[PDB]
């Protein structure tokens, strides 16, 4: 009769029959691979009801493959693997470094699909690029806690008696073709104490324009006056603010 | 042949030894009364001569000031320093003791006044001053009460420095002048012991010497995690250099 019966049973595939058990001549039935199965590129996936109530032949067209290679931050799949989804056991794909990573020549940038349907062990075939030498800050310091490679952070500080002007930290970030420091080297600026206080009936011996950390100012009483106190005071510096060590002496008469 | 009582001399009293009759050739001496001093080169005694007659004697006492009171700034000059006769109007001169100097604008002279007292005293001899103390590098000099003869000054070293030498000085008299008993001490920077090294970590840019408030930053080798403070600083546990605390540790991952 001008109708075929049920289509052939294909291992690991299920046909779309759409609610019927009898099919008219020239009816085309497509199969869909089952769970944990991928169709093999370049193979038929359907059958056709021919004359004599006979279905056309169809061979197993499903496998049996790894999952899409897991997403790496250091490397991206090369073409044509990056667009593929069929990876039977034995399949080897190649990677290429992302930015800002570079190849570690001693290591292979390839992954193989193993018999257990898993990709081989991952190695660091693509390593983190290095930022330039951070250099130095005059009268300050740079803190490099964990190297200067891509993704690293470094902090800046100013020695006692100096004030930091600029950025307090920097990060090695990707910059176009390479990796560069997010911020430039800041500045350590000398902290100045307020102008030293003047005293009644006394003077400052050779007063200077500016006074920095630990610099001193010496006092002297005028003729006929007696000194009572410290002959000199010095500049103390804390939390970036200058302050004299203590009060100036007194010149009492007479 | 015995004389009777000797003559009455104004402002003087004779030594009779409780006698009322005196034999020929008896010599009687008089002593000036309170506030009076005998006039140099004058007779103070009489002698019983023939005819039961005493020899003549004239007033020999003048009201006099007392010997000037001792001053600590100056001393009487010669010849006043050996004198005891100072009638009204008498002026004596002083000269400075050590360690005192003359105050040019003033007179170093005292006058015996009509009331038998010496004129008002002024500071004609003033305390000498020791030389300006100077400065102590990284230290301080406390001058509590001037730098004149007898004064004391103390020395101290700023935070992070240790005093080597004298802790004080006194203005002493030295021969022909006044000088500080002790020379200035030196304020030397205190250094902390060499910072400790850590396993699997390094000291970022180590220095040869670390002073007060100076820090050392640590960094762990690739593949280790730092446990503890990243940097430590040189404190001064008087008067010694000591690190603020232990260095961090590096744990292998």
Curated annotation (Swiss-Prot), chain A:
Where on the tree of life does the source sit, at the highest rank? Eukaryota
Modifications the protein undergoes after translation, according to the UniProt entry: The Ser/Thr-rich domain is heavily O-glycosylated.
Upon changing residue 195 to P, the result is: In Cr(a-) antigen
Tissue/organ expression: Expressed on the plasma membranes of all cell types that are in intimate contact with plasma complement proteins. It is also found on the surfaces of epithelial cells lining extracellular compartments, and variants of the molecule are present in body fluids and in extracellular matrix.
* Spans through the membrane: none
Keyword line: Blood group antigen, Cell membrane, Complement pathway, Disease variant, Disulfide bond, Glycoprotein, GPI-anchor, Host cell receptor for virus entry, Host-virus interaction, Immunity, Innate immunity, Lipoprotein, Membrane, Receptor, Repeat, Secreted, Signal, Sushi
Disulphide bonds in the chain = 4-49, 33-62, 66-113, 97-126, 131-172, 158-188, 193-235, 221-251
Q: GO molecular function: any one? A: lipid binding
Q: What is this protein called?
A: Complement decay-accelerating factor
Organism from which the protein derives:
Homo sapiens (Human)
């Amino acid at each position: 009769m001008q109708d075929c019966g049920l289509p052939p049973d294909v291992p690991n595939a299920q046909p779309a029959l759409e609610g019927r058990t009898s099919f008219p001549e020239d009816t085309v039935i497509t199969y869909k691979c089952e769970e944990s199965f991928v169709k093999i590129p370049g193979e038929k996936d359907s059958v056709i009801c021919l004359k004599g109530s006979q279905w056309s032949d169809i061979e197993e067209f499903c496998n049996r493959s790894c999952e899409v290679p897991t997403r790496l931050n250091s490397a991206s799949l090369k073409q044509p693997y990056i667009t593929q989804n069929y990876f039977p056991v034995g399949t080897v794909v190649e990677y290429e470094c992302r930015p800002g990573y570079r190849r570690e020549p001693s290591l292979s940038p390839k992954l193989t699909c193993l018999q257990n349907l898993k990709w081989s062990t991952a190695v660091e075939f693509c390593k983190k690029k290095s930022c330039p030498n951070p250099g130095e800050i005059r009268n300050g310091q740079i803190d490099v806690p964990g190297g200067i490679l891509f993704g690293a952070t470094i902090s800046f500080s100013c020695n006692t008696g100096y004030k930091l002007f600029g950025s307090t930290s920097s990060f090695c970030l990707i910059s176009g073709s390479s990796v560069q420091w997010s911020d430039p080297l800041p500045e350590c600026r000398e902290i100045y104490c307020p102008a030293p206080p003047q005293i009644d009936n006394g003077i400052i011996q050779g007063e200077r324009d500016h006074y920095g950390y630990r610099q001193s100012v010496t006092y002297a009483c005028n003729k006929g006056f007696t000194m009572i106190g410290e002959h000199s005071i010095y500049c103390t510096v804390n939390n970036d603010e200058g302050e004299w060590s203590g009060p100036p002496p007194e010149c009492r008469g007479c």
